[PDB]
From TrEMBL:
InterPro entries: Ap4A_hydrolase, Calcineurin-like_PHP_lpxH, Metallo-depent_PP-like, Pesterase_MJ0912. Zn(2+) 2 binds at D10, D36, H147. This is Metallophosphoesterase. GO terms for molecular function: metal ion binding; phosphatase activity. It holds the Pfam family Metallophos_2.
Length: 243
């Protein structure tokens, strides 16, 4: 009866971090993707292929996915960009899948977007001000968001009274029994909170509980794969620092 649901966001073509998360998560009944499957990392095809199969119910588009659907005809100094490189990795099947994705899913007690329910693809939620503007923008008890690459939770009354959002620790259990919440699982593939571990959440709707998790992964291996692809050193280094 009770389900256990893996919620992930911002994989960013980091296959090693995604595989580390999948093994870490354990027995799960469903997997939800909040977008940004590609961009930055060395394995965009493999990450799209995985997310496609694993997230049949909730898989929303991120801003990097939406950017990379862009076709370009390039007869050249532009070939230096990591954004351009990502686009060139995608084959028909990956493009078709990304093109199919909704920017918003509403099902039962939850709304899921990449950025914010006001601006699904684009808007970051990282303070009370913006959280407050977003609570009227969804009509379910819960809204799941990504895009900042930092795990986060805030209740509606806190946001409306300008109380700062919470940055959950590894293993932190959040009781979502009462009141409405905006919840961010952090990034699987490019965390930005100074903790280089991959980030995800586990949602158990029957228990009314969200648990936040971090998992170490082999950053050296993703870094090796990026250097092999000729990706810029500034992107390679960030991953060790979690910035
Ligand atoms: Zn992202
Ligand atoms: Zn983003």
């Amino acid at each position: 009866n009770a389900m256990r649901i893996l919620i992930i966001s911002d994989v960013h073509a980091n296959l090693v971090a995604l595989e580390a998360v999948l093994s870490d998560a354990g027995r799960v009944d469903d997997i939800w993707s909040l977008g940004d499957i590609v961009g930055y990392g060395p394995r965009p095809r493999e990450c799209v292929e995985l997310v496609r199969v694993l997230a049949p119910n909730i898989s929303v588009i991120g801003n990097h996915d939406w950017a990379c659907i862009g076709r370009l005809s390039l007869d050249n100094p532009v070939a230096r960009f990591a954004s351009y490189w990502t686009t060139m990795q995608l084959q028909a099947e990956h493009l078709q899948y990304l093109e199919s994705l909704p920017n918003r899913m509403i099902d039962g007690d939850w709304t899921v977007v990449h950025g914010s329910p006001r601006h699904p693809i684009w808007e970051y939620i990282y303070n009370a001000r913006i959280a407050a503007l977003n609570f009227p923008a969804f009509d379910t008890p819960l809204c799941f968001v990504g895009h900042t690459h930092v795990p986060l939770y805030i209740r509606e009354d806190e946001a409306l009274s300008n109380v700062a959002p919470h940055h959950p620790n590894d293993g932190e259990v959040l009781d979502v029994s009462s009141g409405r919440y905006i919840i961010n699982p952090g990034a699987v593939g490019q965390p930005r909170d100074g903790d280089p571990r991959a980030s995800y959440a586990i949602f158990e709707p029957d228990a009314q509980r969200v648990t936040f998790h971090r998992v170490e992964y082999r950053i050296a291996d993703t870094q090796a794969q990026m250097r092999e692809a000729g990706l810029p050193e500034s992107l390679v280094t960030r991953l060790a620092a979690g910035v």
